[PDB]
Paper text:
Here, we provide the ligand/enzyme crystal complexes for one such PTP outlier: Arabidopsis thaliana Plant and Fungi Atypical Dual Specificity Phosphatase 1 (AtPFA-DSP1), herein unveiled as a regioselective and efficient phosphatase towards inositol pyrophosphate (PP-InsP) signaling molecules. Although the WPD loop is missing its canonical tripeptide motif, this structural element contributes to catalysis by assisting PP-InsP delivery into the catalytic pocket, for a choreographed exchange with phosphate reaction product. Subsequently, an intramolecular proton donation by PP-InsP substrate is posited to substitute functionally for the absent aspartate/glutamate general-acid. Additionally, we conclude that the hydrolyzed phosphate remains trapped as an enzyme-product complex, until it can be released in a prisoner exchange with another PP-InsP molecule; the latter process is assisted by the WPD loop.
The 5-InsP7 substrate is held in an 11.6 Å wide and 15.2 Å deep pocket by polar interactions between the 1-, 4-, 5β-, and 6-phosphates and multiple residues in the P-loop: Lys151, Arg152, Lys154, His155 and Arg156. These data also reveal that the His155 imidazole ring is flipped (180° χ2 angle changes) relative to its orientation in the Pi-bound crystal structures. We analogize such behavior by depicting His155 as a Janus residue, such that the catalytic core is overlooked by either of the two faces of the imidazole ring, depending upon the nature of the ligand: in this case, 5-InsP7 or Pi(A). The protonated Nε2 in His155 forms a polar contact with the PP-InsP substrate, and the Nδ1 forms a hydrogen bond with the hydroxyl group of Asp191, in which the carbonyl oxygen is further stabilized by Arg188. The 1- and 2-phosphates of 5-InsP7 also make multiple polar interactions with Lys186 in the α5-α6 loop. Gly118 and Lys120 from the WPD-loop make contributions to ligand binding with van der Waals interactions. Ser150, which replaces the catalytic cysteine, is located at the bottom of the ligand binding pocket and it helps to trap 5-InsP7 through its polar contact with one of the terminal oxygen atoms from the 5-β-phosphate moiety. We further noted that if a 1-β-phosphate were to be added to 5-InsP7, it would be solvent exposed, thereby rationalizing why 1,5-InsP8 is also actively hydrolyzed by this enzyme. Interestingly, catalytically productive binding of 1-InsP7, 2-InsP7 and 3-InsP7 is hindered by P-loop residues that would clash with either the axial 2-diphosphate or 2-monophosphate. This helps to explain why 1-InsP7, 2-InsP7 and 3-InsP7 are not efficient substrates for AtPFA-DSP1.
Author numbering: 50 to 123, 125 to 214
C-alpha cells in the first residue's frame, strides 16, 4: 500500500521546483508521479546508467553544472550556480528537480540564491538552508548567499511562483 519513496532530503521549493539528494531506482516510481521536464544536477560525476535510462524513458532533460565538492574551511563556484539559476528560472524547464549528492550544500546554495531573487530576508533564507543541512550547515554556504549579487537576474519574471 505505502510504496512511494521520495529521494533523500526531497522537498517542494515552489510551483514546478523540487530539491533532493541523488535519486536511485527505489525513488523512480515517486519521481514519475511529478511529471518532470528537467533535472538540474550539480555534481561533476557522470550520471549512472540506471538514472540515464529513467531520464530517457520519461523524456526528462539533464542539465549538469558540476560543482567540485569542498569541505570547510577550504570555494563555491559563482559561475556554475548562476548557470543553474538561469535554467531554473525558465518555466519551460518545469517541473524541475534540483539535486546533488545529499541535497544540502550545492542544492542548498542554489535554492538560497533563488530565495534572494524572491526577496526573502537573509535570516529566512538561512533558516530554510539550515533545515536541510542540519548538523552539516556551513557558514561558507550562507556567506555565499549573503554576498550573492542579484543584479543580473533582477529583471527575470517569476509568474510561475506561488509567491506573486
Ligand atoms: O563535512 P565534509 O567536509 O567531510 O563533507 C562530506 C560529507 O559529510 P559527512 O563527512 O558528514 O558524510 C558531505 O555530506 P553532507 O554534509 O551533505 O551530509 C558531502 O557533501 P554532499 O552531500 O556530497 O554535498 P551536497 O550534495 O549536499 O552538495 C561532502 O561531499 P563533497 O563536498 O561534494 O566532496 C563530503 O566531503 P568529502 O568526504 O571530502 O567527499
Amino acid at each position: 500500500e505505502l510504496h512511494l519513496i521520495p529521494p533523500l532530503n526531497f522537498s517542494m521549493v515552489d510551483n514546478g521546483i523540487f530539491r533532493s539528494g541523488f535519486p536511485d531506482s527505489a525513488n523512480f516510481s515517486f519521481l514519475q508521479t511529478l511529471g518532470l521536464r528537467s533535472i538540474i544536477y550539480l555534481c561533476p560525476e557522470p550520471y549512472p546508467e540506471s538514472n540515464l535510462q529513467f531520464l530517457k524513458s520519461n523524456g526528462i532533460r539533464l542539465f549538469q553544472f558540476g560543482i567540485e565538492g569542498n569541505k570547510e574551511p577550504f570555494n563555491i563556484p559563482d559561475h556554475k550556480i548562476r548557470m543553474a539559476l538561469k535554467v531554473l528560472l525558465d518555466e519551460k524547464n518545469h517541473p524541475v528537480l534540483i539535486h546533488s549528492k545529499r541535497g544540502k550544500h550545492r542544492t542548498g546554495c542554489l535554492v538560497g540564491c533563488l530565495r534572494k531573487l524572491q526577496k526573502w530576508c537573509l535570516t529566512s533564507i538561512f533558516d530554510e538552508y539550515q533545515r536541510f543541512a542540519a548538523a552539516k550547515a556551513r557558514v561558507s554556504d550562507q556567506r555565499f548567499m549573503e554576498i550573492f549579487d542579484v543584479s543580473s537576474f533582477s529583471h527575470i519574471p517569476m509568474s510561475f511562483s506561488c509567491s506573486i
